Each structure stands twice: as C-alpha cells, then as structure tokens.
Design an enzyme around this catalytic site. Sequence first.
Site, short mmCIF file in Angstrom:
data_model
loop_
_atom_site.label_atom_id
_atom_site.label_comp_id
_atom_site.label_asym_id
_atom_site.label_seq_id
_atom_site.Cartn_x
_atom_site.Cartn_y
_atom_site.Cartn_z
N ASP A 63 0.82 -1.19 -0.06
CA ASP A 63 0.02 0.01 0.03
C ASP A 63 0.83 1.28 -0.01
OD1 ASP A 63 -2.38 1.85 0.55
OD2 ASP A 63 -2.67 1.00 2.51
N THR A 64 0.74 2.11 -1.02
CA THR A 64 1.61 3.34 -1.26
C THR A 64 0.84 4.62 -0.60
OG1 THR A 64 0.04 3.48 -3.64
CG2 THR A 64 2.41 2.82 -3.55
N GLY A 65 -0.36 4.34 -0.29
CA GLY A 65 -1.03 5.29 0.40
C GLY A 65 -1.12 5.46 2.09
#
Lengths: 99, 99
Positions: free
Chosen positions: B25-27
Amino acid sequence: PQITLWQRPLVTIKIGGQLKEALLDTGADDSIVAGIELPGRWKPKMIGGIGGFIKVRQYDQILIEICGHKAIGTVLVGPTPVNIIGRNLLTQIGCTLNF
Amino acid sequence: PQITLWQRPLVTIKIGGQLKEALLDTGADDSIVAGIELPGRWKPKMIGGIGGFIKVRQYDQILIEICGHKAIGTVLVGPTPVNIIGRNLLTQIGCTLNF
C-alpha cells in the site's frame, strides 16, 4: 515515469474543471475525492476502510484526467482525509507496482 | 517482480515465525499488522485513517521478510480490518510505481 516512495505518491487531477491533487493508492479498491462538486444521478454505496465506514456517493461515468492521462471511471465523493486514485482508475492509466 | 493492479497486490510476509498475507500500500505512511503476538516493548502512537482513527503499538526495529526480501522498520499492531505494508518498509525492498 517512476515514483519512488520516499515522498507520498501525489499526482494532480482535473475533474470537471476543478484541479485537485490526489494520491495514487495501491491498497484502495476505489477512488474517493473530497471537496469536488460532481453533477448528476448517483447510487449511494457504503465503503469500508479501517475503523471506518463512510457513505460515499457513487457517481458513475466521470471523466478524470490523472496527470495528463485520461480515464472515465467511477469516483466516490466523501469526507475523506487525502484524495485517492485507487485501483479502478490505476488500471486504466496502466499503473504497475515494481521491485 | 512487477505487480499488475487488476487484482489486489497481496504479498506474503514472514514476521517472527508467523507467515501471513499483506497488501502492498502506497497510500499508507506506516505499516500496520493485526494481532500477531510480537515480543518486546512498545511506544504510544495512534494514526489518521479514512472514517477514523486507531491506536497501535509503535514497534521499531522488527524484521519483516516481504517476498523473500528482508527489511527492518517500524510496524504498528492494532484494530485494522486489513493488513498493510506501507511506505516506511516499501522503499527498503525497492518498490516503485511505474506508468
């Protein structure tokens, strides 16, 4: 291009004349933006997140230009903290996670 | 390897003899894991999410083997609906968002 997760992955979006900044999120199945005035018929769905469930407004067929790549997907309007461009739009723009 | 985002990027993680699956997960600025019994001391911290807020255990310097790549960073344990491998570990294994 390549971004390089030492900075939070932000990109600019143009959604119906409103220029807003949004985060590319690999762990978000949907894209939810806050603050935009979106115009028409909508089906109300309820989304989940962590310690959270917020009623989003599901608006279908909304053109959103993500960093100068266009995609016509589905955008949810809600009281979210940061704007998200989730997998449903990421796929259209051809985004890949790599290592 | 480069993960296509048409299907959720769920990778296997090894953390303290416990093998589990996690989202790339980049966010998420921090990596959060559900109640996996982890050994040591913990510092207070509670983080911001969509919908609300959850209290976690700031566990610094614990090793996590993500897709056989060893990394060591701050893992958070708590009321998460779902497991996340966030930015603080994502750049140690070498992850980039390409398009």
